[PDB]
Amino acid sequence: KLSEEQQHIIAILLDAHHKTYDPTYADFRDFRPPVRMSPLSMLPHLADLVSYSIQKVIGFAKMIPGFRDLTSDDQIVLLKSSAIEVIMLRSNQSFTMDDMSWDCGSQDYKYDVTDVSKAGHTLELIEPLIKFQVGLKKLNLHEEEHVLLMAICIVSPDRPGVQDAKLVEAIQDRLSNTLQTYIRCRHPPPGSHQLYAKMIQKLADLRSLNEEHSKQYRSLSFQPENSMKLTPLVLEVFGN
């Protein structure tokens, strides 16, 4: 039942991800270096990592079918509200349940709960973040489902400040129906059992994670010495 339009969408999104996610992690050497041993010693490195990721998320979003039919203002509202969530989603590709860490090809660039703690965050965020990463990894998503879920996340019509919420909803529905039909036609049981509902629950989980990250980010970035270590793009997108 996967229409030709739906096959087209999946192909575009797969290509978009391949063009915006580099699983060699070669660019990490351009970031300010990790420091692991009170001070927020990992804030410079993780700010650069996050800023880099935001650029990749914007590059992916621009390729979503229909996204560029939105106004510039609506494109900005969707990216500002979703970037944090898509970073959590896309980072699941490097996350491993072996030791609950994000392994980006190198001991320098393998991160655990202690690293994000050394950027100022607390267990109020980290504990649900890890639960989310585990629950998402356990879904064993096809790459097709992974890229559809990122795109559905970005094109959400209930983000605050959306103007043309009905066009946003129209675009998201085309993606949602593509995903629902993909699961039925290409994801064998038992892996497909309740799969779409479980993926939509992950989008709900991300809203709560967004809220707690935003709360902690506001507290951290209110201190000028912390803001000094951020990047201009992080300040624009996450807030100043």
Binding site: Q55, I58, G59, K62, S72, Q75, I76, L79, K80, P232, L233, E236, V237
Partner: peptide
């Protein structure tokens, strides 16, 4: 409340 960097990355 302007987003020149985001706006620039959106082409």
């Amino acid at each position: 409340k302007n987003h020149p960097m985001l706006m620039n990355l959106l082409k």
